[PDB]
């Protein structure tokens, strides 16, 4: 029952909704013991990961966080978030 919560601070709720969505719907290659909880709060995004083995845990963590990093480099090269 390893839990890991994290609050990414964004400039606007635009990034909140985006980085909540654009990584949620994927039923990850490994949610076997992993629960991905993506809760938007204002312009901050809280995310809580649930796991039972730390290897696939770390893989999920860093893989996600680099999908994040790629959303970031896109919001630097195509963004920052446009009003929708």
């Amino acid at each position: 029952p390893h839990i890991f919560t994290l609050s990414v601070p964004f400039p606007t709720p635009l990034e909140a909704e985006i980085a909540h969505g654009s990584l949620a719907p994927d039923a990850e290659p490994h949610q076997r013991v992993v629960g991905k909880d993506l809760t938007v709060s204002g312009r901050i995004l809280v995310v809580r990961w649930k796991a039972e083995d730390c290897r696939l845990l770390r893989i999920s963590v860093i893989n996600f966080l680099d999908q994040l990093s790629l959303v970031v480099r896109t919001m630097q090269r195509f963004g920052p978030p446009v009003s929708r």
Partner: peptide
């Protein structure tokens, strides 16, 4: 993994580019 890494950009530029 190639597809999910292919994908996160697709979903993101979708949610952002509208």
């Amino acid at each position: 993994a190639p597809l999910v890494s292919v994908a996160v950009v697709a979903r993101t530029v979708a949610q952002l580019w509208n």
